[PDB]
Design an enzyme around this catalytic site. Sequence first.
Site, short mmCIF file in Angstrom:
data_model
loop_
_atom_site.label_atom_id
_atom_site.label_comp_id
_atom_site.label_asym_id
_atom_site.label_seq_id
_atom_site.Cartn_x
_atom_site.Cartn_y
_atom_site.Cartn_z
CG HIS D 54 -1.63 -1.10 1.44
ND1 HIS D 54 -1.44 -2.39 2.12
CD2 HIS D 54 -2.94 -1.24 1.27
CE1 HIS D 54 -2.24 -2.92 2.06
NE2 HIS D 54 -3.33 -2.54 1.53
CG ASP D 57 1.78 -1.11 3.76
OD1 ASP D 57 1.41 -0.77 4.85
OD2 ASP D 57 1.20 -1.84 2.72
CG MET D 88 -1.04 -6.04 -6.42
SD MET D 88 -1.29 -5.26 -4.85
CE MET D 88 -1.23 -6.70 -4.14
CE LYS D 183 -12.11 -9.08 5.74
NZ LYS D 183 -10.93 -8.17 6.62
CD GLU D 217 -7.39 -12.07 2.30
OE1 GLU D 217 -6.87 -11.00 2.05
OE2 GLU D 217 -7.44 -12.74 3.59
CG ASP D 245 -4.42 -11.03 -1.71
OD1 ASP D 245 -3.56 -10.92 -2.73
OD2 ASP D 245 -5.22 -10.23 -1.17
CG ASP D 255 -9.22 -11.23 7.38
OD1 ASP D 255 -8.68 -12.20 7.34
OD2 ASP D 255 -9.16 -10.03 7.18
CG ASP D 257 -5.66 -11.90 6.84
OD1 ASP D 257 -6.51 -12.48 6.38
OD2 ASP D 257 -5.13 -10.54 6.90
CG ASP D 287 -3.28 -9.89 2.48
OD1 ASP D 287 -2.76 -9.52 3.47
OD2 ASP D 287 -4.39 -9.08 2.26
MN LIG Z 1 -6.11 -9.34 0.70
MN LIG Z 2 -8.19 -11.39 5.10
#
Ligand SMILES: [Mn+2]
Ligand SMILES: [Mn+2]
Lengths: 388, 388, 388, 388
Positions: D54, D57, D88, D183, D217, D245, D255, D257, D287
């Site tokens: 991002h 980031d 990306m 999402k 994702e 992702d 989520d 992750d 991700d």
């Molecule tokens: Mn993602």
């Molecule tokens: Mn996630």
Amino acid sequence: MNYQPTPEDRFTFGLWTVGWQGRDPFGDATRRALDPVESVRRLAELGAHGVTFHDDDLIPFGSSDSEREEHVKRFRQALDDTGMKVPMATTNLFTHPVFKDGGFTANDRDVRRYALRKTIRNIDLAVELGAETYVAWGGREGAESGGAKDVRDALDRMKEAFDLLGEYVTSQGYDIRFAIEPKPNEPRGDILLPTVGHALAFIERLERPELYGVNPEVGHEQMAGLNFPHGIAQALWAGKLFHIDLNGQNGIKYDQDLRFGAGDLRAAFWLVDLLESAGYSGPRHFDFKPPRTEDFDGVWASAAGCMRNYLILKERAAAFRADPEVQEALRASRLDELARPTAADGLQALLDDRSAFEEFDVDAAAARGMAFERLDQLAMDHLLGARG
Amino acid sequence: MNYQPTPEDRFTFGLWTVGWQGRDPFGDATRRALDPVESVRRLAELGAHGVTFHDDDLIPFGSSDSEREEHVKRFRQALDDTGMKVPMATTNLFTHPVFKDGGFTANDRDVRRYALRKTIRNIDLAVELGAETYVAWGGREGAESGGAKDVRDALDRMKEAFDLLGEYVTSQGYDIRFAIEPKPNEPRGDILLPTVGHALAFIERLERPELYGVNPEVGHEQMAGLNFPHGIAQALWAGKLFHIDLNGQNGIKYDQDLRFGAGDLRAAFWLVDLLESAGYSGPRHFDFKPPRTEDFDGVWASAAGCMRNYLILKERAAAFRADPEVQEALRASRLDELARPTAADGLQALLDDRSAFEEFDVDAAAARGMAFERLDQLAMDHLLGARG
Amino acid sequence: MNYQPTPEDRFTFGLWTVGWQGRDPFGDATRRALDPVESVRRLAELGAHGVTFHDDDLIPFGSSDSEREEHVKRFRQALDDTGMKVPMATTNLFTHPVFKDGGFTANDRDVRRYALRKTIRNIDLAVELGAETYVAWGGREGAESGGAKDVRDALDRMKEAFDLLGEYVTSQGYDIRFAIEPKPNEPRGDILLPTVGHALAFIERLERPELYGVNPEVGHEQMAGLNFPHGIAQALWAGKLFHIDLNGQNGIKYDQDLRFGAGDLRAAFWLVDLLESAGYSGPRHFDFKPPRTEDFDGVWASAAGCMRNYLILKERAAAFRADPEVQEALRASRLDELARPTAADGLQALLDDRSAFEEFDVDAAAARGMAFERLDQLAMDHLLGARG
Amino acid sequence: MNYQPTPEDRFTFGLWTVGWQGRDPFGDATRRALDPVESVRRLAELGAHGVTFHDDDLIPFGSSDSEREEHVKRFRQALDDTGMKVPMATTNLFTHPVFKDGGFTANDRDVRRYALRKTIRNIDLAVELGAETYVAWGGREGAESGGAKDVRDALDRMKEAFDLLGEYVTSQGYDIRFAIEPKPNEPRGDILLPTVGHALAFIERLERPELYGVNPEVGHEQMAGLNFPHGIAQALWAGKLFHIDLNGQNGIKYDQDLRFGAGDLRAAFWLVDLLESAGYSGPRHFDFKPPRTEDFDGVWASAAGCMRNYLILKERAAAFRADPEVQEALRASRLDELARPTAADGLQALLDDRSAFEEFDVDAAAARGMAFERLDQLAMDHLLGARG
Ligand SMILES: [Mn+2]
Ligand SMILES: [Mn+2]
Ligand SMILES: [Mn+2]
Ligand SMILES: [Mn+2]
Ligand SMILES: [Mn+2]
Ligand SMILES: [Mn+2]
Ligand SMILES: [Mn+2]
Ligand SMILES: [Mn+2]
């Protein structure tokens, strides 16, 4: 109409509710920090009865004794100024990184010992402030992976911890009782004691079970897709509803902590109906978060809405139960018969009763409708104020 | 390799599993009915140890005494012919329309009495066939609407029923014990005793708790999004794992009853690891349904796969626990310390220990990684046979 | 008050709704079969506008031509006797065992061809009865296991099928349009086109997309935990809400098919608000099941309750939108600004606008509360009839 | 064996993955911040191909031009030093409080304009760094309450935003394409475009649909209980899988992750099988978040495990598809027939084919088993390395 709360209604709020600054994992704070004194004053103006706290909400982590004394002094002055009470307190065993694998069930023994000392210090404070109930939410007790946590060992540690706390309160002659708060997940992948049932079962293995009950939260049970009124009924049946946390949740997702009445509205109705019919006498405590979209005006509106919604639902549930047409529908659906013993005549009489087996007309019984849909539509009509 | 089951492995199957004809609510049967004799023979050929039954699986509902005797005689001959055992039996208190509002907690008292008589008749049969465990799955106990069922009253009725059954078994001198099977929902909107925890808690309120344990099912706990190994660990901790039902489920949906190993494969691994490490000695019972897409060849393949998957997972879990590199990783993650008492020194010593509070270096403890990801990747490598 | 439906309200019901005999996978029928003629008469008496059917609801599977003609004749007489309409029809491609792996996406090509012929026959009938919409719910399209179904191939087959049906209707000059009904799971482990979004996306790949829309069902989207009003909004945005199925669901579980208004009551409110604000002109169709606890009196009560609840919610949503205090709160929350173009000035003007970047006061904008909680409590007060 | 990744495998990671400091809503950071330069170096040493970012980031929010230039210079030097790529990039339209009600669909128009300018600035940077794909995850687009967000208006705003971005890239002659990341919820109560299907459907309404695809994702689709391989198959069918992702999730909850391979292991297998069989040529992007229990050694172990698990699954899926016994089982289950047109003979021929209706032996077809359980057990045996 106008559903105005007053302290007699026993509505309470955590400092961390209205004081939530709006940080979420994908988001920074949207509101400035609130001084607890201000929260006490604003909640009192709304008609709240009291407030609750984690240690670290009232006294910043790492405070000196002089700082601690002053934080508590200011808080006590606000309580005295407003007439607000402090019925419950709890320990923060989840925010600080030291608790990343748990407090009472951390794999590291030194962390487990520290968690107990941190809790004991705050039990003393809670008693000084007049709290009757001490909540424990083991939000870090659990795991993301299977090898990380042997659950039998963790339950041994959890029992040891609660037994030591019971020994402590007994040794000090304190009247305070504990309320264990289940949650299925979040922040851990799975949390130990994930539901009201698991917590009730665990309590029965403690050395002094009478000192412990549950603190169920609407949204937590709903995060497992469970029926919150049913779980409250089981806690009441067991004599273990020591405290309750009220909020809203839309099903199976992260813990939303919406204001009470939001989320599953019909479940909120049946919950209020149950608490009121059972004569639950504890605080009606709101553990919720005003959404981070809101400014402070919206914080106080959301808090006010918690109480308003409880009072509307209380009115509608009472009207439902008092309506002669509902009373007739309850008899039509055999709710009266559900409340009668199955076999007060005893086992031998049941075994000898041909009406219970050889001469039981199964088809006639099967043909009898339960009339539950008519009953439920009367309930809907009462909730919506659509009777006549 | 080749993961071949034999009766010594104690794998059991319900008659209703391999005998499921494939009716679902949107679908008619896809397979003809199986004679129990044929099921016993085919399961024995696959290496099963035994079978289980509901009353109505073995003896058609409404059978005469002569019909009943003959059904049982044929079944006993098949068991004798094959060496198959019958370790568990149960009552069907859910299929017949008379049970539409429940068996033990039906609002209609006459139905509750009939449910008890139907169960008692089958307890006698179970004992005759050598069963050690009598399961009760109250699939119709619950509600679709809030007014239909007062849960405190229903729990009173449920306790009365189980207490009467305990009085019965005690009066007859039977050694059989009961295992209560929780499920959160389906076929009722919400089922009473929805999880292992709720069932464990309820048992503690029975008159003779020692006679009762749980019969958890993989897919049922997963229908509430719960961690099945964790719940089994709590049941083992309580001394209450009297029986277990093994199958597969993909999360939160209708009860799929996939073959064991399907659904959540890693949960299946951690379950087998736990049962084997704990020395669980009961049957490994499969309560599953071969999908309705299958013919009989597929039925037997699916049953064989249940056993095969258990045996593969058993091998991999044992290899994981025996691997010196895993043993080192477990110590690195402080699983050894989790198993040590927090404060065997006692409460006063903990209160006097400055290392537990004033002199506890919270930042140093917080900085110590748990090493759980390395441990979990060793677990993954063992499950997948990707070590070296 | 008294929320009495009449045919002008355009409420419709499937024959299979009130005609559901109560079989579930763990349970036998609790009600006798209903003659479609009786259902038409009873629904008309309640104030329904019309009925819908699967082929096999109206004409028993395997009927001769003479039987078919007579079933249709009797049904037409009942429609004529009552003034009931038939706005929608559909094919049963799920009950018969031949469809165990699908209709249009069965792995067996001969089954796919048969499914198309069965559908085409019923399209002709639907047109004869005056239906404007032909629904397709591919309840058997999907899989329990990963290897069983290549989804790209299945989507190729599904597109072929819908394209052939579009060619057929175009060749016959029929005005009827198709509505694809998504569902995430049940009876298959996962169903193809599991949500409104997936169905909308698929339609865009058909040869004649204008002939196809969606038939979303409240409970189906809620079985994926999705927001049903949001999904309806996206379908409306796309111009694709060709039909809608109304019922109730409590979250993530088997498809409950509760009466409309039951389940998620607030979602029902926001749905009605959206349909009414958007001017949706299609039937308000109920695809629900009176619970199997009920006798026929309860069937008709449950059907009546569907309509009653829609009408109560319609009143409350209209009152919400018309209330000047709500209109002010909507402006306070910037719902007016949401409806204004972001950059009608165009891309270059946006790029040149310092107020959009260098001179944008991010902190001032961030500090502005959204006032959503006050707005939502006005919505709650309107729903509950607690204004003043 | 030993499943060692190299840059040729095209594994990529977000800076925010390994750089996650461990803050959750109930918890403070457990790890110090990572310099992007260090992350690039450490990921390269593990065999990664590249990194993604991002804006915020790489360049702290609010940086001056001189600071921005230096941050980018240091990052470019690390990429050059290691050979790492940047395939990306994306915009952070969710962390800053200004985005509390959305970026592109904020109710406040000035916020929508700012969100577009922030994105456009970062598109320029992405192109400079060589990115082929620009992801948009509208994590703040949505609502907690029904009145707060009119979804038709919000979709109009979302379309306007994406159309303006497409105009921008076209005007600059850039080759970069957009990938919209769905999402269902979290951090908003419900998020707009909640699934792959909804995103695919929305893209078809954009002015230049060819410029837009999806970035699904694993865990996001699983948060709606959906089948991730099925959704990927639909995206591939549509020609819209522009990026992916990879991570792990245990069902319906926040989520998580988790690292790829964790969570639903069998879904991970079928995903890899699909990507590899389809010849997907994009990055395999992770991700994920190393759990906050971990120190930096655990961060790198977790990242390594993502790649390792992909490579193990790739091997097993390839072996499955290449095994002659599996190829035979696929034919036995008619996967070959699924891939053949239903009616290449055309509509009239189908209508004239008596074998498709009058002379179709429905019972014979229904009796044919699908053999899916044997096929799935071969798949299980291949995944577990239990063949022979
Ligand atoms: Mn993602
Ligand atoms: Mn996630
Ligand atoms: Mn909560
Ligand atoms: Mn709480
Ligand atoms: Mn099951
Ligand atoms: Mn079972
Ligand atoms: Mn449905
Ligand atoms: Mn439907």
